[model samples]
Each structure stands twice: as structure tokens, then as C-alpha cells.
Target: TNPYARGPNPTAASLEASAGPFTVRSFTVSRPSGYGAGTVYYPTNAGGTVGAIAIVPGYTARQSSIKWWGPRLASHGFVVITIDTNSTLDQPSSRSSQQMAALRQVASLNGTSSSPIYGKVDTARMGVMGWSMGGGGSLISAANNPSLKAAAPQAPWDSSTNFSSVTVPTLIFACENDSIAPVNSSALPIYDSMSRNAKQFLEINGGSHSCANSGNSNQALIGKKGVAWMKRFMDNDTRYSTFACENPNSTRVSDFRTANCSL
Candidate 1:
């Protein structure tokens, strides 16, 4: 049923019986075109309706970063889709165009009988997440989307423009050690230009674009905090207060557990 560049990895990762009051199912999304694919996770006992999230990975990324948030969000009773947009290096247009396709794929999967979970997803509530180049892509998508409820762009690239036009509640996450999408040039402009009901910026200490393996474990901690964000905005769970994302230290990141040491 699927053909992808990587091996036909098992669609399911070990499930979490329950995380915080939710039971989650993990599966990999595949493209018949044999392009790129990703692991998607969602709640199985969602009581027939719940919010949805679409997470797009960075440049050349194959959805591995989803490994951090997919399960966490599912555990909170949210439907999450992580997209893999790996394509030619210079094709910016392709990158942006494929995202809509990914969104459509998500809709088709959840709505059709082909969906293994039996039509339990609530398509009305939708959110998007993007990192690096995908963040730039998300900016473009958010601008054009007629139904976007919220967005979270992590270290968006400079190609992202016209943030002032954005109407949805959005969050910008920045890392100081990231030179690829530097804060001064990328996050700062978006933060200043965006005029919306809710908009905020979060900066993490000891943060770097490539520091996923830092001994200090900032990555996992940041992920835990991010899960709270999705629960509040996407899943409509306010148990965790809405993080304003203002000031550099609104959220926490551990320096000892490093990321992007070379950064």
C-alpha cells in the first residue's frame, strides 16, 4: 500500500496506554508516490471528536523530529500528523506546494473508511507546526489558509515574510545557538510584524539547531513544554496555562543538557 525511500518501517510504535488521561496510537504515514513519509500519532479513545495538529519537519528532514512531539500530543488526546517534505535542495516552490498536499492527505486519512480508527477525528479543529525551512513553508501556508486555527513556527527561516498579515494565534520558538535561522533575522522580524489576538516568542538557553543529542537533555524538556502548548491551543485543554511566549525566558531549557554544541 506504500512505497517510500526508507524501508517499510512498522506503522506502529509501542503505544502509551495512557499519558496524562489519554491513550495514544502511533503509526507511520506513507505516500503511494514513494516520496517521503512520517510517523503520525493520535488518541484512540477520543470520544468521537478532538483537535488535530500537522507538524512539518525542517530542510531535508524525514519527520524524525516528530519523534519528540507526536506521541506526547497523542498522549494528551490530540490527533497529530507529522509531514516529511524531503525533495530537491533548491526547490523552494516544491516545498511550499507539497504541504497542502500533506494537509489533504491528513484529511483523507481521518475521514475515510480506509482510516483504521473508524471516523473519530474532528477535522474542524486544526493546527500546524513547522521548523526551520518548514517554518517558512508554514508561514506561507498560514497566510493562504482559510481554516487555520493556530500555528507554531520554530526558528523560522528568513524566506518567511508578511507576518503582520497573519490572523491566527501564533507562537515563535527561537534558539540562540542556531545560525541557520538566526533569531535576529528570522524570529525578531516575525515577532515585531505579527499583529494578532495572541502572538509570542520563546527563547531557550543552551539551544542550538543541531543540539538534539546534548547531554543536558534540553530537547526532551522543551518537548514536554511544547506538549502543553498543543494541549492548550489545539486540544483546548487549559490545564496548563497559556504560555505568553514573551521575554527570552518565558519557558525553560537546560544548558547542561546541550543541543548544537558545534553551534
Candidate 2:
């Protein structure tokens, strides 16, 4: 009875194509508590409820920086919310708080009669994602909120690299040549610190800090990896195991690391 389960999407593995069996629609949240605001994307014809993910942008950035994840993930059967921070100056910790707030709002929408997502969100199967400091915030959110099912942070940066307490599944996307948040200092250390959890790290060769964003040439691969990670962990779907556990062989990927891929 899984309404959003895969159904003959011939191009499900391609980022250039829509992945889900359902059509998607998006709307803006006019007044979300704690967070600035957000845009929600959900499958229009999902046969049943679907999980949700909330994404935040980095310092001095807005929703547009991470908006593409909305459709990318939604098309794969997740309700995705991309948000703007209450202030562009917010750090990872601040962004983490707002990220949770957005998820809360998404859960709340599940019962609001006027909302399109009423009775459609499986809030217990929630996840988080982000870019830069926001990416670091996603890690913090996972570390702090054990209830979160999955997390994926891109080129994350934070002063505190000790995320050893995180037990949720995580995927860290790193830009091998990032100047802003160098791989050795930020993403790598953070990934290394999450020893107690299921985790994966993908490093894009010669990529900038924003390498996983919408227009990145590696979207096809990055999108596949991300969707696979979320589907595997968030939905507890085994169909994505091959996509999640397998090592990347492309010239675009400089390095890859993973643990607990079987779960």
C-alpha cells in the first residue's frame, strides 16, 4: 500500500529526469514559526503518506541556494522543504534550530485542513540536509535530534568538529577543491567523528564549495547518491542498497567512504 513506491520510472536514476512515480507540486509557507519561511514540495498523486525532509542554506545565503533539492527529493517520494534563515548571519547552530523548526511545521501541516499536505506526511520518518554552515547545521541537528532518520550535508563547516555522538544515518558531500570549507578541516573531520552511526562521504573532484547545488555538472551523480541515501535510511527501503553501498567509478568523484551500508 505504499503510494509513493517506485513504479516504472525508467529514468529514476537520472537527475536530469524526474525520479518518482507521482507528479509534484510546491507552495510557500507564509508564516512558519521559529524559521524565516519555506517552500514545500510534495508529490501530487502519491497513493499514500510520504516522509519529509527540511533543508537550510549557509551563511549569507537564501533558499535559492538549496532549492533544487526540493524537486529532486520530492520527485523521489519525499516531502522537501527548503527554507530561508531568520537572519542570513545565522551560524550552523542557529541554522540547526531553524531546520528543526521547519520540520515541525511540516509535521503540523499534516493535520491542517486547509493545507494540501494534510494527512500526507509521515513525520516519524524525517530527515535533514543543507549547504556550507547549513550543512554543518544538518550534522548538528542529527547529533542533537536522535529521532531524525537521515542527514546529508554538503561542504559542511563548523567550529566544533566533534559529532561523535550522532547515531543517525548521515551522508557528507565534500568538494575536493573547496576553498571556503576545506575538506581536511571540515567535512572529513566531521565524517570521521561520526563513528557510531551509518555514514558515507562523497568527494567531488576539483569542485567548489557549492559543488552539489542545482547547476553543478555532477548533479546526476550527486543526486543519485543523495536520493539513494535518503531512500535507504529514511524510508528504510532496501531497493536503494545497491545505489547507496556501491562505490562511485566516475572521473568526477575523487573519493568515497562509507560505513553501515547494509542497514
Candidate 3:
């Protein structure tokens, strides 16, 4: 069980409230509670197609982390939604399926929410993202999803499938010392798996898996890079063309390696 578990947690509800002008809602794809199907919602900058991203959380991870990313992504002019999937180390088989289902649901609600507040989403411009186990699940879903314009995985697990299935642009972020998803485990596989387009993999210099997101200093840098990637791929702005492509194994913990090298 997740020792840091926050059940029906209030934080998940009010966490993203500080993100002014953004609205948060909760939605579930199916029933069966624990194992069946589930997801949470964060509609930032709704009624806009600038781009929309669906986020999956780590194993046993609560949907509250969106508090940090929801507003940030909204500030960049992208609709960001975070989801929670059924997963635990001992029984992690069906997680990928749930993630796929959640992706579909995200596509639906994001497509037609409400006028002035919804329905403005482009629907065609979408992406998937996650941390830890959800990171791995995101790859599986991304492989099966042709609509995914891009992807970003933080400390992801890359065992079941290589990053090859991800046909769209992608960015893999992690810490060099992270034991949960280790640099060698997922980052390398993702770099090797990505096809032609731009695929980036970065490892933060001094932080553990958990530390990558918990603090303010390193967190801001990683978050900023993610926003930049979303803007380049989702909005098709050429200003960030230098970063639109993926970087071969280049060690950049600072500035998220805004595309300094190429494959």
C-alpha cells in the first residue's frame, strides 16, 4: 500500500485551486472502484486547442501531484489533465489497459466539455505523460494511440516495451540516481526505441526519484522544459525549433538540454 496514501484526499480537490482561471473536476471512466477503472480531471485553459495533455500518475501515486503541473501547463496555454490508474508492484498487469481506457476517456471529455469552458479543444492535438509506473503505462497507451502528438515521461519504467512504439515526439526526464526507474532502465531504452523524429532523454544531476518533483529548485527547471516541449510540438511554434527534436545521450541537468545536440 502507498504509505503516503491520501484517500479521497482533500488535497487532490483543492490542490490546483491556486491556479487562477483554471477549473478542476473529477471524472471516472468505469466502475469496480479499486481495479475496474478510474481517473481525475484538471482542465487548464479550457476551450483552447493550443494543445491538451493527459497525465498518468506513478504506482500508488495520488492525483494530487497535478497541483504542481496543472497550473504550470495552463500558463503555457495547454489543457492538462492528470489521471490515476489501478496499480501496485505486486499486481501491475492490467495497468496498461486501464491507462488506455483512461486515455480514451480523456480524449472524449477533452473534446466536448462545454462552450466557453470546453469544446474548444482541437481533439487532434493531444499527448500523454506520467511518472514512474504510469510512465511505462503512458508508453503503452502512446504506442496504441495515433492521436498522441507528443509525450513526456518522468522516471518512467521501460521494461515491458521499448520506447519504439511511441511514433510521436517524446521527452524522457529523470534523475541519474533514481532507483525507482534508474537511468539505465527506461531512459536508455526510450532513447534507443524512439524512431526518426525528435526524442529527448534528460537526467537531472543531483536528485533522487522522489526529489525530482518534491522540491522547488529542480522542479521548476524540469517543469519549464516540459512546458517548452509542449509548446513546440502542440502549438507548432518555430521559435523553439532547436528543442523540437530529441537529443542523443547528452548530460544536461540544467536548462533541460533545450536541444543542444541531435541524433
Tens digits of per-residue lDDT, candidate 1, 19-103, equal: 3445678777656222356566777665556667776667666566545667666665667777676563523345445665665
State which candidate, 1 or 3, has the greater TM-score.
1
For residues 80-183, could you state the per-residue lDDT of candidate 2 as single tens digits? 99999999999999999999999999999998999989998988889999999899899999989999999999999999889999999999999999999999
TM-score of 3: 0.72
Best model number under lDDT: 2
Q: In model 3, which runs have C-alpha deviations exceeding 4 angstroms? A: 1-47, 87-93, 110-117, 214-216, 243-263
| Clash statistics: count for each candidate | 7, 0, 2
TM-scores, one per candidate: 0.76, 0.95, 0.72
Clashes of 1: 7
The lDDT values for all models are 0.58, 0.87, 0.57
For model 2, the stretches where C-alpha displacement exceeds 4 angstroms are 1-19
Query: Which stretches of candidate 1 lie above 4 Å from their native place?
Result: 1-19, 30-35, 86-93, 211-216, 219-221, 236-238, 241-263
Error of 2 at 257 (Å): 0.7
Better of 1 and 2 by TM-score: 2
lDDT of 3: 0.57
Would you list the rank order by TM-score, best first? 2, 1, 3
What is the lDDT, from 0 to 100, of the residue 230 in candidate 3? 72
Collision pairs in model 3 = 198-246, 199-246
Compared with the true structure, model 1 gives a TM-score of: 0.76
